[PDB]
Amino acid sequence: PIAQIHILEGRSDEQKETLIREVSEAISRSLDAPLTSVRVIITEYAKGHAGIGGELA
Amino acid sequence: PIAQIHILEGRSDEQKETLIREVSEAISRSLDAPLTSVRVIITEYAKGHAGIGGELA
Amino acid sequence: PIAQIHILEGRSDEQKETLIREVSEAISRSLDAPLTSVRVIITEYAKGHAGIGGELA
Amino acid sequence: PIAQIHILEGRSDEQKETLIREVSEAISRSLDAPLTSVRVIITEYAKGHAGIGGELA
Amino acid sequence: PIAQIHILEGRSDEQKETLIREVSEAISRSLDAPLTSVRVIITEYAKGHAGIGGELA
Amino acid sequence: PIAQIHILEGRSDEQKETLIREVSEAISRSLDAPLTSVRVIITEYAKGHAGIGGELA
C-alpha cells in the first residue's frame, strides 16, 4: 500500500517524520498488511499553491 | 491535509472505513491539525494493475 | 498542464463532460497556455472511499 | 472535490493564484457543488522533470 | 520509487502486464535502483473521464 | 497516457533525462501508442518525506 499525503509547508522535520510513522502504522493495522510494505510520501505546498474555495490557504 | 491511499482491492467496506478513520486520526495527531480538516481518498487497484519488480501482485 | 480532478461518484456523463471542458478552458485562460496542451483526467470515488474527519461522506 | 494541477515552472505568482480561483469556479458550476468544498493544489515541475515524447519541455 | 501510470481504458491484461514489467525495468535501469524496489500502479480512464483540449478522448 | 514517477532526490539530471525518455518509450510500445502523446512528470522526495517501514528512506 502507498500513501501520498499533501500538506501545507511550514512544518518542522520533527512532525513530518512522526506523520510517516503514525500513518504507516494505521495502514498496517487497518488492512492487516505488513508494516514493511507500507509507503508514505509527503508533498508540501506553498502559500500560493493551495486553494480552499477559490481563495489561498 | 489530503491523504490519497493506494491499496490492492480485496478489502471489506468495514476495513476501509477503519482505514479512513485511523489514518485521519493519525494525521490530526501528527500535525496537531483539526480532524475536521482532514480528507482521505482511497483508490483500489486490481492485481493486474499493480507491480512489484515488474511482476504482478 | 495536467489536471487530475477527484470527485465523488454520482454525476451524469454530461456534468463530467462539462467539467472537463470548463476546467480545461480556465487553465488555458489563466496561464495563457494553449488549450490543446491541456489534459484533464477525472477520478470518481465511491461513498465508502472518501473521508471528512475520519468519517464517510 | 479535489483538483491537482501539474504545471511547468517559470510562471509568476499572479498567474498561479488566478488559476486556483478560476479552476475552483469551473468545478463549482459544472458539478453544482458549493465553492467552499473545492480544493486546488498546484504542483510545479522543473524543465528537467517534465516530458512530451521522451524529450524535455 | 513509485510510478503511477494513467492510461485510456480498453486494453488487454496482457498489454498492461507487459507495461508494468517494461516500465519497472526502465526505471530500475535509469536510476540504478533495485528492480525489486520498483512499484507500478495503473489507473484506467473511461471515454468520459479524460480530456484533451477540453474535448473527450 | 501519463506517467507520474515518484523518486527520492539525489540523482543527477542526466539520469532523470534518461528516465523520462526511456520510460516514455516503454509506455508507447506496450500500448502501441504514439510516443509524442506520452507525457512524464517526476517528483523528488527529501529524506524526511519518504517512508518505507514507518522509518525514513
Author numbering:
A (entry chain B), B (entry chain A), C (entry chain D), D (entry chain C), E (entry chain F), F (entry chain E): 1 to 57
Give verbatim lines from the article:
The enzyme 4-oxalocrotonate tautomerase (4-OT) is composed of six identical subunits of only 62 amino acid residues each. It belongs to the tautomerase superfamily, a group of homologous proteins that share a unique catalytic amino-terminal proline (Pro-1) and a characteristic β-α-β structural fold. 4-OT takes part in a catabolic pathway for aromatic hydrocarbons in Pseudomonas putida mt-2, where it catalyses the tautomerization of 2-hydroxymuconate (1) to yield 2-oxohex-3-enedioate (2). Inspired by the versatile success of proline and its derivatives as organocatalysts, we anticipated and found the proline-based enzyme 4-OT to promiscuously catalyse carbon–carbon bond-forming reactions such as aldolizations and Michael-type additions.
To obtain insight into the structural consequences of the M45Y and F50A mutations, we determined crystal structures of mutant M45Y/F50A in an unliganded state and in complex with substrate trans-β-nitrostyrene (5a) at 2.7 and 2.3 Å resolution, respectively. The overall structure of the M45Y/F50A mutant did not reveal significant changes in backbone conformation compared with wild-type 4-OT. Hexameric Cα backbones of mutant and wild-type 4-OT superimpose with an average root-mean-square deviation of 0.32 Å. However, the M45Y and F50A mutations did have a pronounced effect on the active-site geometry near Pro-1. In the wild-type 4-OT structure, the side chains of Met-45 and Phe-50 point towards Pro-1, restricting access to a small hydrophobic pocket at the back of the active site. In the structure of mutant M45Y/F50A, the side chain of Tyr-45 is rotated away from Pro-1 towards the back of the active site, where it forms a hydrogen bond with His-6. Combined with the replacement of the bulky Phe-50 with an alanine, the M45Y mutation results in a significant opening and enlargement of the hydrophobic pocket near Pro-1. In conclusion, our results reveal that the two mutations (M45Y and F50A) unexpectedly created a new substrate-binding pocket. This active-site remodelling is most probably responsible for the observed differences in activity and enantioselectivity between mutant and wild-type 4-OT. The progress curves of these reactions demonstrate that this mutant, in addition to inverted enantioselectivity, also has significantly enhanced ‘Michaelase' activity for the addition of 3 to 5a, as well as 4 to 5a when compared with wild-type 4-OT.
